[PDB]
Design a protein around this nucleic acid. Structure first.
Length: 817
RNA sequence: UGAGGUAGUAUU
């Protein structure tokens, strides 16, 4: 795509904030100012795994030196791209015919010159900043520096993993944790940077399929009371093993991919087998394995794996199959597996810092023969960078004392403070979906008493007892009760729903409440009803007040950016994709006052895995319209925070979405052209920042302080990007959010935009804490997540779209809080 | 589902 909208240059660096010395997991890379030669490699067959492509090229490099490669050490991306330090002695296009040994594998390979890539030009961009960074030069460098690791380890995205050795972290259900590292090369001022971080992801364990089945179905002993799998067990087992690769053990080692699991057991599952007589008969898998391999199945009552093409009949008894090693788990982990993995992978900032250092020392990048071939040198120590801790905004509260809150280390509380605009709760009801013996009437009364007191101190007075309180069982009971409530109790403001933990009832409560009836609901776990704490109750009130149209607090007005001198709307946008049928979900929220405090939400479904927000123009138009309704002001500026996108698609996302925002404005009025600031906020990266002075480490996790900002040294050489760690680190190693200013009509300075971004992280209503991303971005995530619950069903795109449309009386509410 | 933070989140 011809990039029409060029990203704005960095207008300057920030000067505001207390200086803090930091170390970054970015290591300086020195490159020679030379030409690098780019060749295209065409392999047939062309749909082999990258691993196989690498084996093919490695064979060629070793067997074709006097002809082609000489003493050069080429680097290869496992696909189309090969690089060498000097030109290959070829005119144009050489075709090869090789027999790589395992059955024998024959490949047809052709190689031709594609381009000359200049690393001098790359250097000149990094030092001057008067030319665009040559991406083709960066790619060549990236391929050279990860070539060896790609041969040694198992690549996963931009990371590398290897089988566990000296450690073992089973997750259950046939999954385990592999440790490894991320590696990427990134342009910075003066020099390229090698970004290295430790990493850990889920892999399927290399074990017999039988044992894999027993973990998935939670079977302690396959030999205790042996019996066929129930229909539920089969489907459950099938969903886990379908798509996975298995290997057989009855032939001394062929691999297959599982396409299905037979309903019939091995004793009865048949297939057409041609005998020596020429006659074809329906032979069972058990009979076949007995006659062919003299194998007596120990578990003929168990199903078979169907492998290869579904159209044909290749069945494998479970007991002759192993799960193939090295298969990454793309499927979602259970709540239990998630907890176990987080536990085994949690690393404090000082510990991660040491692991990265240790990795770099042991890696010996300067002893990599391919790195040496290309005359590349890597600095041993982490890049030093002086960050700045931005000042936190003061928050204004209400009540008769009108207290202010001053954040300390990214945190404040409501002690002695009342909501800026607190709602009085006259009419409210309680629906208890936890059983009576689990949540007695006496427990209910104590909960509501403690809640009414906390709410009174917070300036959200709950008058009297609930108008209605009753027990109920099952999600089927939600709609009848809710409809009854809406029709019986006039002026009903809130339903408090007590839940027995994880239950389908929650999704139904939100469906009926948000989309069907348009009624405010607040769910609470029964454990938090039985054991009440002022802190939990206080946090509950934060959500309730906002859901009922209140304002918890505001930024002190005179300590904000000058953009507030004119009507300005803040947008947050997010896209969530379905786990590894279901659609992708897009969400855009928009501020509805000048604080900015209250937000309205829009949400859509679209094609699975599509990153671009397809309906953005319509969504923005709705928000602009609602903004005008609420404020009677036409926004002169639009500040758009877009939650993370893959950087490989970033120029495409900006192009179409910036057009869509502009499109929305013009369709409202022909000459309506408000100033647009488009900011991408990213958490899914591997940039790590550590306190250089170990005494400045905060808490047990020992992370950098909230407000720590970096816009030098490791950032883009001329574009407008910065890291801001807005949150207190209380768990593992903090991820500083990365902000990329892709467009700015509004002439923001670095300080102004960095501070504005920080302040927005203090406007998030769910907690009195500075959060890791601006509230509009966070709100957008919550809206998309809520839509997923709305989509829960107990088909066609049109029905899916209707399922996420909230009720009329919900459209102008913060139901997502 | 009080809340934030965080590992990960493409032959038979």
């Amino acid at each position: 795509l011809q990039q029409v909208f060029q990203a704005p240059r960095r207008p300057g660096i920030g000067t505001v904030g207390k200086p803090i010395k930091l170390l970054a997991n970015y290591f300086e890379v020195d490159i020679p100012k030379i030409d690098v030669y780019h060749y295209e490699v065409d392999i047939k067959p062309d749909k082999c795994p990258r691993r196989v492509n690498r084996e093919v090229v490695e064979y060629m490099v070793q067997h074709f030196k006097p002809q082609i490669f000489g003493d050069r050490k080429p680097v290869y991306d496992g696909k189309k791209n090969i690089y060498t330090v000097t030109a290959l002695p070829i005119g144009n296009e050489r075709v090869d015919f090789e027999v790589t040994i395992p059955k024998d594998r024959i490949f047809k390979v052709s190689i031709k010159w594609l381009a000359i890539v200049s690393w001098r030009m790359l250097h000149e961009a990094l030092v001057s900043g008067q030319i665009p960074v040559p991406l083709e030069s960066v790619q060549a460098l990236d391929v050279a520096m990860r070539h060896l690791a790609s041969m040694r380890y198992t690549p996963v995205g931009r990371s590398f993993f290897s089988p566990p050795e000296g450690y073992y972290h089973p997750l259950g259900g046939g999954r385990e944790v592999w440790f490894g590292f991320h590696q990427s090369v990134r342009p910075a001022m003066w020099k390229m940077m090698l970004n290295i971080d430790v990493s850990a992801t889920a892999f399927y364990k290399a074990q017999p399929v039988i044992e894999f089945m027993c973990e998935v179905l939670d079977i302690r002993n396959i030999d205790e009371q042996p019996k066929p799998l129930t229909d539920s067990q089969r489907v459950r087992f099938t969903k886990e093993i379908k798509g996975l690769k298995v290997e057989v053990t009855h032939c001394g080692k062929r691999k297959y991919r599982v396409c299905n699991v037979t309903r019939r057991p091995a004793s009865h599952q048949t297939f057409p087998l041609q005998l020596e007589s020429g006659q074809t008969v329906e032979c069972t898998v058990a009979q076949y394995f007995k006659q062919k391999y003299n194998l007596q199945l120990k578990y003929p009552h168990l199903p078979c794996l169907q492998v290869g093409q579904e159209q044909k009949h290749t069945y494998l008894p479970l007991e002759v199959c192993n799960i193939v090693a090295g298969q990454r788990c793309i499927k979602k982990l259970t709540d239990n597996q998630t907890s176990t993995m987080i536990k085994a992978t949690a690393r404090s900032a000082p510990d991660r810092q040491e692991e990265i250092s240790r990795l770099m020392k042991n890696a010996s990048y300067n002893l990599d023969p391919y790195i040496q071939e290309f005359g590349i040198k890597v600095k041993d120590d982490m890049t030093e960078v002086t960050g700045r801790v931005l000042p936190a905004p003061i928050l204004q509260y209400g009540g008769r004392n009108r207290a202010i809150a001053t954040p300390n280390q990214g945190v404040w509380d409501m002690r002695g403070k009342q909501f800026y605009n607190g709602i009085e709760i006259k009419v409210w009801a309680i629906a208890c979906f936890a059983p009576q013996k689990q949540c007695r009437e006496e427990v209910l009364k104590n909960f509501t008493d403690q809640l009414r007191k906390i709410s009174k101190d917070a300036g959200m007075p709950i008058q009297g007892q609930p108008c209605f309180c009753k027990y109920a069982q099952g999600a089927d009971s939600v709609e009848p009760m809710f409809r009854h409530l809406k029709n019986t109790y006039s002026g009903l403001q809130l339903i408090i729903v007590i839940l027995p933990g994880k239950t389908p009832v929650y999704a139904e409560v939100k469906r009926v409440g948000d989309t069907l009836l348009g009624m405010a609901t607040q769910c609470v776990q029964v454990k938090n009803v039985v054991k009440t704490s002022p802190q939990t109750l206080s946090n509950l009130c934060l959500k309730i007040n906002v859901k009922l149209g209140g304002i918890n607090n505001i930024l002190v007005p005179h300590q904000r950016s000058a953009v507030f001198q004119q009507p300005v709307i803040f947008l947050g946008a997010d896209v969530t994709h379905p786990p590894a049928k279901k659609p992708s979900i897009t969400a855009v929220v928009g501020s509805m006052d000048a604080h900015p405090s209250r937000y309205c939400a829009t949400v859509r479904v679209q094609r699975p895995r599509q990153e671009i927000i397809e309906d953005l123009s319509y969504m923005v138009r709705e928000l602009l319209i609602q903004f005008y309704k609420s404020t009677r002001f036409k926004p002169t500026r639009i500040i758009f925070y877009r939650d993370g996108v893959p950087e490989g698609q970033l120029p495409q996302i900006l192009h179409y979405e910036l057009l869509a925002i502009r499109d929305a404005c013009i369709k409202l009025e022909k000459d309506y052209q408000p100033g647009i600031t488009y900011i991408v906020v990213q958490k899914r990266h591997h940039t790590r920042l550590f306190c250089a002075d170990k005494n400045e480490r905060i808490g047990k996790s020992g992370n950098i302080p909230a407000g720590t900002t970096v816009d030098t040294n490791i950032t883009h050489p001329f574009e407008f990007d910065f890291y801001l760690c807005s949150h207190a680190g209380i768990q593992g190693t903090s991820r500083p959010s990365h902000y990329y200013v892709l467009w700015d009509d509004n002439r923001f300075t670095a300080d102004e935009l960095q501070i504005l971004t920080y302040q927005l992280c203090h406007t998030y209503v769910r907690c009195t804490r500075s959060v890791s991303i601006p509230a509009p971005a966070y709100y957008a995530r919550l809206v998309a997540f809520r839509a997923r619950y709305h989509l829960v069903d107990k088909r066609d795109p049109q029905a899916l779209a209707k399922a996420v449309q909230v009720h009329q009386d919900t459209l102008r509410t913060m139901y997502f809080a």
